[PDB]
Amino acid sequence: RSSSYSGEYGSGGGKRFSHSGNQLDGPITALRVRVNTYYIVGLQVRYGKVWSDYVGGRNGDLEEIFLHPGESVIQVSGKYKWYLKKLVFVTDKGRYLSFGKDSGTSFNAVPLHPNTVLRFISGRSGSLIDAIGLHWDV
Ligand SMILES: [Cl-]
């Protein structure tokens, strides 16, 4: 069994979401994160050439980062309070894809099993991102 799960990081408000179906579209190839003065407001993840359904709220500015072909996320750190505040996606090409404000309770997620990478995310959302979980696999 190579799959593992890190989380859930954050709190209990909002509604649950999961990108479990999306990994069939492809590897993660891009990230959209909506950010405001204090929080991570929303998330979208591109699986192959297909963006996930948008989750979270509308009160923030959209930031977008494309991963290079064949680049994988191998660690995710972040910060929260009652809501998510910071995410850093660490890649196997040595990049640190950072979003949000450097404040709050710290977390540091790494995969349990050998040569696994981030395959999808889940969490909770409303008008903000309440919580996040990371799903690792081959
Ligand atoms: Cl699309």
Q: How is the secondary structure organized here?
A:
Blueprint: E1 4-10, E2 15-18, E3 28-35, E4 40-47, E5 50-51, E6 55-56, E7 61-66, E8 73-80, E9 84-91, E10 96-100, E11 105-109, E12 117-125, E13 129-137
Antiparallel strand pairs: 1-13, 2-12, 3-4, 3-7, 4-5, 4-6, 8-9, 8-11, 9-10, 12-13
The structure holds chloride ion (CL).
Residues 50-51 line the site of chloride ion.
Would you kindly provide a brief summary of this structure?
By secondary structure, the chain is mainly β. Helices cover 0% and strands 59% of the residues. It comes from Homo sapiens.
Structure characterization notes:
This protein is mainly beta and 138 residues long. The chain has a single domain, classed as Aligned Prism (Vitelline Membrane Outer Layer Protein I, subunit A), CATH 2.100.10. The protein has strands at 4-10, 15-18, 28-35, 40-47, 50-51, 55-56, 61-66, 73-80, 84-91, 96-100, 105-109, 117-125, 129-137. The strands form three sheets. Strands 3, 4, 5, 6 and 7 form a five-stranded antiparallel beta sheet that branches. The protein has a four-stranded antiparallel beta sheet with strand order 1-13-12-2, with no helix packed on it. Strands 10-9-8-11 form a four-stranded antiparallel beta sheet, with no helix packed on it. A hairpin with a 4-residue loop joins strand 3 (28-35) and strand 4. It is globular. The chain binds chloride ion (CL). Residues 50-51 line the site of chloride ion (CL). Residues 3-138 form the Jacalin-type lectin domain. This is Zymogen granule membrane protein 16. One of its GO terms (biological process) is defense response to Gram-positive bacterium.
